[PDB]
Ligand binder design. Structure first.
Ligand SMILES: Oc1ccccc1-c1cccc(O)c1O
Ligand SMILES: Oc1ccccc1-c1cccc(O)c1O
Ligand SMILES: Oc1ccccc1-c1cccc(O)c1O
Ligand code: FES
Ligand code: FES
Ligand code: FES
Ligand code: FES
Ligand code: FES
Ligand code: FES
Ligand SMILES: [Fe+2]
Ligand SMILES: [Fe+2]
Ligand SMILES: [Fe+2]
Lengths: 104, 388, 389, 388, 104, 106
């Protein structure tokens, strides 16, 4: 199940890392200060990579249309997004970032 | 949302109604007759500014928004119904289920991640009394009864009608239909002479303001409406005078009609009895866009058997449709059109000078303002907007 | 009121004039000929954006706003004049007196508190020289003469004319009419050959700026206007050159016309003598709405008796109307239309590149800005707007 | 400058392109064929919202803004070319040289100080391959090659074509042209059967995002464009399915066409080979105003002499123009028109739901945004504005 | 002649009281600081009750269209109102408010 | 001829403009910017306005017709709709007398 992504220190705060997964959709890992969150990478509104967007606190802004999601709940924060993001639990243990295998 | 805030601030009695240029969301609206849509022949219409498609599949009606999710084209430019249960966009073949709007296939890319992950807006559709009603709203619909006048849905009530597009805002249609003093415009109607109606020129009000109307804030089914009671303590005017000289007379026929007149959300008038003592009229003024409404006219007559229904259908086509729906209400159409310029800049909502019989209209504007189920906005049409 | 503040701030010489897109309130305007309005047959028109009704009662003209006080319908959709002195709205039968606009009766409710307590807007109407003038303004009107050019109202001056609706703003019609160099557009007019006119192509001006015009604000009847004096010190152009080669000649006929040209508030040109040495032209450009005007053409000829009047009328019908009012002024109509696009966004008032003869147009813009009796606004049309302070 | 700033802030990937409703200034655009403009016959056109006059003098083309400096009338309302080298405004006879736009004479005032001190806007014009290109821009033009697709200017490439005015914005035309999945709309074209074409319904993409296209900004002549490489890792779709059942098939003809598709600034598509394996299509979508474009269609075929040029012309008139330019591309016109309403309020640039093949369109949006030579504004049309 | 309205202590400053007269049109009584004023209740522009409006100093705003009047002079203060109100004389006697049964 | 006597330097306050009329030639405008003097053609290049009837804002003259403007030192347009540079005329003070060139700088 759990996917070891990176060293906590591999991500500067307010940055996003794309996690490619063979035979599955990519994930986005968000560093929000000292916390880590994970969603699907693909905006639910289109084909945009949320890892190429803009983190404002715990809200990711899509780079295509300015749609946005809460990276903690996956719920739309800004139009035109309406379909919730899949959220993946993440655990930091011993400075290592792990992301759940499937969404809650 | 829809009107200059400086105007909405002035109309404190009824700001939501004045804002409701595109109509009230989260209500049922009649848009066509059952007979106008056949099995597997999709039909286009615009309702509250939204392009819609209605199809009949295994006898049942389904309504999809006529706007592809992908590039915003109308599917109806080139209908491709390639299976019984689906419609395929003509452009890149995004395919949607009639039943739930789900994007179930894309012929141009069967591996697309969009498949099963998008939904075209659907609206509930119900047929009742030969009429097609669309719930232009979000979530589980209320009972149709909520949005229909009393008795329209009675088991024995036989409904026949006519529908057309009229060039006025829906509210000008509602107010004209519920206006007690607008009866003046009908003084020369062929119906009044040829059906021997009693028709005054108007009413001199009696009693107090509160006695001029009866507001219904609820019943069994959550209906919201106003009865016009001007005739309860009012004096019918049969002689019109200028400087005390008689210049016009009302109609002194024997047939007493229009004893109760009520207007109901979302904008349907009941006139009982009309146009004959044994019948009722129910008419909707259905918002198509800011400038246009459906004038959805029905006449109801209790009928116990197929012989009564057949006879009523004959009298409808030979007499009631031409003499009443056309011969009486045609003057309502050009009266509605005559108010367009004064309200078109939204300034008529400030500059109008009301008189006593307008208590009916005022009661409707307040009821409508207080009990509507939502204001349709241009953003509902283009796509709801929110910044976090 | 009517134009972006940033444009008005740029046109410091004539901002009120640039703001006056709907025309000047509190002036008289001609809208039709007397013979077009018959006893008890009300007629509709739009003046300064306002829908009006004119009626003739015991031979006298009356003007009511064609907008019922109640729900804002035009009375004219279905005219009910039920007594000689009144009009009854077709909708709920609110009844108004032609004489004072007072709401005197309501047939749908003869007990209404509104009766005797409301009044529909009236405008003064006056007939002179078989033309119908409406004072589109408030309070007791000034004398008509203030808003007419010199001689128009002369006892012996016989006035004949033509009126029609033109698709330009009124100001484009005024400036074109008063434009000394626009004579170029008339060089092939049938009037030029067929009435043997002298007509230059233009003018090399001479003298100083002040000598190019006579600004009249000292007229005893309060008339305000400008004379075009370009030809007092100017050399008329009869041979137009490119690269020093003659490419065009003016007209070398015997009849001298357009000696004195003057523009008068609220927007009426006097051309003398024209289109013949013994006649005058008086034409108005009357604002209907921001996009349209009446082109109200008149020709004056002094006449002494019915014989001269009938012969004048015959030549008007057979020669002056077809050959001058149409054959000459038709080119003015499409010249006006050709300026619409540049001025339609109000940016033409900034971007125009003027030359010397436009001094006449500038003098008019300043006169109009300083001496107009009010700026018509959209709020005059809909209903005046004011908040307590 | 042209679009609500709140919409532009939302489209961070391609704001300049969304702002470019009037098109891109400082590029070459084709506007007519050489054969359509004869000696001393001035022709009017609107390009990027500007009214222009074109004239041919001693066989050379000259372009002047069709707006007199004086009172802003179109010279073209009544053309007065009094000398071979000049045009005289019909109003007050301000006279301009075709060659440099200098106000060289005023017939109405030969003493005017304006004479020799004003200049009407001129634009570079050049004819190549029987096509009239105007450089709608300021200063010394770049080489034409920069704003043409590869091989359009080849020595032996014979160019024939057709031009018309279409009622959509130019960008809808460009995106439709370069859209890999829009091939679906062509499935019943008379060209597909009558010229024996292989034509899929669409593509299942393969490989990563960067592999879907080739962005060209290394071309030595400075041309800037994108190749559609969907077919390099993609599986073409010949069997279109709904619920796994085949409802439509592609075309299994022998002739292989559209091996390479590229879009180039300022908005010209190259399809090779098309509509036959020995031919190429180059088509421009030239901005006229916010609502309309020239659809400037050309077919190129290598021809070695007059005999081949002549047989190509006869084939063009009898086959390629009716079967391909009309029979194939007519569907493109009504596809473009179908997207107008969604994009007309500028909201479609936010609300569109893209899928995988739209990678090509996004690559073009970003290219166009980064490498365009300027944004035409309404102030370019009315007269540029600046406060000190 | 005089109608007894209320005890003067019954009205706070800035408040309005509807006076129903049997067989006659209603009146409106306004308390502006310590002074009382009276007008027609019915707005001259229509059929609104001014008693349902908003008092701002000595200016009553109509709830229908935002027309307004000076409650001392009965003169219009805001558009769309053009017709002056009937003013009714008020008199406080032994801390009780009285309104003149006809206008002045 | 070469140098045209305008006025005494002291006859002009900072931020003012003086029109200089000439026989057989177009008028000039002289501007005092602090203690310095500049001269242009008086006629706005966009039309027939007198720049001497405009407003001087530091070294920028604003035309009274349309709000176009020029740098009085360089003659170059500073505000739309002006596009054509003004002719500039050298100014010199000699015995506290302001002198403007009869011919513009090339
Ligand atoms: O509302 C009415 C009152 C009296 C008589 C007829 C009517 C009437 C009947 C049907 C439709 C309408 O618009 C009416 O005014
Ligand atoms: O203004 C003019 C100057 C010279 C010749 C004719 C006219 C003229 C004549 C009639 C009506 C007009 O508007 C004119 O300018
Ligand atoms: O781009 C294409 C892909 C497959 C088949 C035809 C075309 C094509 C051919 C001519 C003009 C166009 O705009 C096309 O998209
Ligand atoms: S693709 Fe993310 S907001 Fe549209
Ligand atoms: S617009 Fe409908 S599938 Fe593309
Ligand atoms: S609108 Fe005229 S009487 Fe009602
Ligand atoms: S508008 Fe062209 S010369 Fe006057
Ligand atoms: S009814 Fe009072 S302002 Fe209109
Ligand atoms: S004349 Fe000076 S800015 Fe136009
Ligand atoms: Fe009616
Ligand atoms: Fe003229
Ligand atoms: Fe195509």
């Amino acid at each position: 199940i759990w996917l070891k992504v990176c060293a906590a220190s591999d991500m500067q705060p307010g940055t996003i890392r794309r996690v490619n997964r063979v035979g599955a959709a990519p994930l986005a890992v968000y560093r929000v200060g000292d916390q880590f969150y994970a969603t699907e990478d693909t905006c639910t509104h289109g084909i945009a990579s949320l890892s190429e967007g803009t983190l404002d606190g715990d809200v990711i802004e899509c780079p295509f249309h300015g749609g946005a999601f809460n990276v903690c709940t996956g719920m739309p924060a800004s139009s035109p997004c309406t379909v919730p993001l899949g959220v993946f639990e993440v655990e930091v243990k011993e400075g290592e970032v792990y992301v759940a295998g499937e969404k809650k | 949302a829809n009107v200059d805030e400086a105007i909405l601030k002035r109309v404190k009695g009824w700001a939501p109604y004045v804002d409701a240029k595109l109509g009230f969301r989260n209500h049922w609206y009649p848009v066509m007759f059952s007979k106008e849509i056949n099995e597997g022949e999709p039909k286009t219409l615009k309702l509250l500014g939204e392009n819609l498609l209605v199809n009949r599949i295994d006898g049942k009606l389904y309504c999809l928004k006529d706007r592809c999710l992908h590039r915003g084209v109308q599917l109806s430019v080139k209908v491709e119904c390639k299976t019984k249960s689906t419609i395929t966009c003509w452009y890149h073949a995004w395919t949607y289920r009639w039943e739930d709007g789900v994007l179930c296939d894309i012929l141009t890319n069967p591996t697309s991640a969009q498949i099963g992950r998008q939904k075209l807006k659907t609206y509930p559709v119900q047929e009742a009394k030969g009429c097609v009603f669309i719930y232009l709203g979000d979530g589980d619909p209320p009972p149709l009864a909520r949005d229909t006048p009393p008795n329209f849905l009675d088991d024995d009530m036989e409904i026949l009608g006519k529908n057309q597009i009229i060039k006025s805002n829906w509210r000008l249609a509602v107010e004209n239909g519920f206006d007690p003093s607008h009866i003046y415009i009908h003084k020369d109607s062929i119906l009044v002479k040829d059906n021997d109606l009693a028709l005054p020129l108007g009413f001199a009000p009696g009693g107090d303001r509160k006695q001029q109307t009866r507001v219904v804030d609820d019943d069994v089914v959550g209906r919201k409406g106003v009865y016009d009671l001007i005739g309860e303590h009012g004096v019918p005017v049969f002689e019109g005078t200028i400087g005390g000289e008689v210049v016009r007379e009302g109609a002194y026929g024997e047939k007493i009609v229009a004893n109760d007149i009520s207007i109901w959300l979302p904008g349907v008038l009941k006139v009982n009895p009309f146009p004959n003592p044994d019948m009722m009229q129910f008419e909707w003024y259905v918002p198509i866009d800011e400038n246009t409404h459906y004038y959805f006219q029905t006449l109801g007559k209790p009928c116990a058997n197929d012989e009564e229904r057949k006879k009523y259908e004959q009298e409808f086509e030979s007499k009631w449709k031409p003499m009443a729906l056309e011969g009486f209400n045609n003057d309502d159409i050009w009266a509605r059109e005559a108010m367009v310029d004064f309200y078109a800049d939204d300034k008529g909502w400030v500059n109008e000078i009301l008189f006593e019989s307008d208590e009916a209209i005022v009661a409707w504007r307040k009821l409508a303002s207080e009990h509507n189920q939502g204001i349709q906005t241009q953003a509902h049409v283009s796509g709801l907007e929110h910044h976090h």
